[PDB]
Subunit: 328 residues, 2 copies
């Protein structure tokens, strides 16, 4: 449809290119424009044994229909140095951010209805001397978004996180009224606007096991979480909880739920990965644009070996398509 999507293979030495090529074996419901190096993809394809019709595409006139099953659109972006699967090279660090910038600005301009990102390697970018806090932070800065919320999803289950990549010992003190308020509002606003859910029903996990057990297993629920959720409900948000995480994450309770708000990383991702057989899409909430991503790393050691699972990227693409439909 008139809805175009930018696909960023990410770190050239990683499986990003691989995955994108593998998913090029099937025709897409929409024109999927891969912003990367033609040569990169060509070689990776040859290395994988696969055969894809890397069809060049120019900003002068974007495509209109999806590439044939075995073809992949490519908005060529030059590498700085040749590539070898599984071998990082700081010389190509700028090339990575270039693809991300093209993809992000494209969405901001309206040429792209949304973007899907394959794995990037933070370490090699920092080694090139390029300021890079991370994949998500980069896009946030590009879109001038001060606050974002990380929401993981698999078919039939969405889990937003109050805290993300932090040592477990730093979690408890990070749970504040301010933090929960910011996260809840963004989660609500986006499920409504980007997923077409008028009144999102969000189940909220307690921080402590058994959600603090009436205050006998931690005080955070009584002192912080409960008062916060109470105020938010009065403001219109349908937040249910705090509920014990191991009670909430069950078919019964999830049946009438649009998303689960977990307090920290390992409290919500295991169930999601279990359910989806390791396939999960990472959605950045709070941005003016639509962006999804796979949750796994670059897997340098598996690059060009074909021994990879494209489930995550597959789910990442579908989620992006759906969001655009509901309205960006």
């Amino acid at each position: 449809m008139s809805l175009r999507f930018a696909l960023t293979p990410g770190e050239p030495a990683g499986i990003g290119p691989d995955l994108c090529l593998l998913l090029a074996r099937s025709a897409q419901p929409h024109p999927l424009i891969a912003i990367a190096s033609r040569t990169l993809l060509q070689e990776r394809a040859g290395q994988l044994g696969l055969a894809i019709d890397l069809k060049d595409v120019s900003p002068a006139a974007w495509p209109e229909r999806p590439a044939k099953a075995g073809q992949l659109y490519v908005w060529d972006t030059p590498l700085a140095a040749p590539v070898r699967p599984g071998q990082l090279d700081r010389a190509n660090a700028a090339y990575v951010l270039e693809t991300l910038t093209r993809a992000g600005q494209g969405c901001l301009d309206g040429h792209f209805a949304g973007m899907i990102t394959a794995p990037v390697h933070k370490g090699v970018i920092n080694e090139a001397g390029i300021p890079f806090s991370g994949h998500t932070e980069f896009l946030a800065d590009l879109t001038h978004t001060a606050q974002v919320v990380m929401m993981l999803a698999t078919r039939g289950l969405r889990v937003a996180l109050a805290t993300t990549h932090l040592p477990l010992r730093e979690v408890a003190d990070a749970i504040s009224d301010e933090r929960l308020t910011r996260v809840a509002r963004i989660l609500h606003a986006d499920l409504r606007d980007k997923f077409g859910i008028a009144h999102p029903r969000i189940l909220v996990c307690g921080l402590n096991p058994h959600a603090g057990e009436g205050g006998h297993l931690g005080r955070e629920e009584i002192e912080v979480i409960e008062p916060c959720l109470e105020r938010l409900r009065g403001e219109g948000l349908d937040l249910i909880g705090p509920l014990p995480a191991d009670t909430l994450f069950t078919p019964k309770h999830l049946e009438h739920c649009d998303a689960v708000l977990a307090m920290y990383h390992d409290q919500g991702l295991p169930v999601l990965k279990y359910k989806g057989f390791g396939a999960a899409v990472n959605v950045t909430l709070g941005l003016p644009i639509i962006r999804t991503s796979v949750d796994h790393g670059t897997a340098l050691d598996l690059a060009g070996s074909g021994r990879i699972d494209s489930g995550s990227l597959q789910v990442a693409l579908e989620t992006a398509y759906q969001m655009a439909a509901s309205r960006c």
Copy 2:
């Protein structure tokens, strides 16, 4: 050779008595002795519209054969006050602990092969002025066991915990070389001795997300967990990890392990409950006796209603029977 098992209905006002009465409709493979008030059981039976014959048991003659279908052995233990389903009464707190003591001491004295516990209400016990941390802690003290290991299980999945009922902020400092080492050894030994697994394959979770990510998200894996597990692997224990929790909990890996060892409550139980809530048994490892239990609450508002699921307690019974046969 004859094996007797103690059964404790637990909190009188809860559904424990109900569950024990319902399961009594089927003849057991071993004599199952309910340690509770005979009058309580007879009244709850009438309340439920169930026809169960209560056969008195004397410590002077522990029955060798199982009771008949529709019959339940009862070692009468007096209540302090009449019981009203759904209504807690601190006057009966001592009664609860008395039945637990009789069961535990009965195993320690060699009369019982194991014990199965139905739900108890910790709150009413503490309100009666009796220090009680919970079921597991009470038994560890009664048996003078310094370290026990809580393991939840359902068909196809067993999850042991390094720490249990602890506020999240206390978890990190609790993961010590001493604790982890004891916990791992107990899990390996019991899977070998009580579950008949010659060479247990155990997947171990890191404390931090991504298992610390090379020490970038916490140093515990590097400084404590890795060294400990490495030490034990050098002793023949097939422990794999530490690995990211959301990686270990994928079908791909679970299919090849005998148990998962999570560092804390909400890191491992959500997946277990998602997979087998309603057929999940809580097994206390490390005790000099065998004890299993359900992991649901007393459901005070369902007492006397008959709208309950005895599936969990059923699995708890079968698990104790199997463990005892395997050998305490």
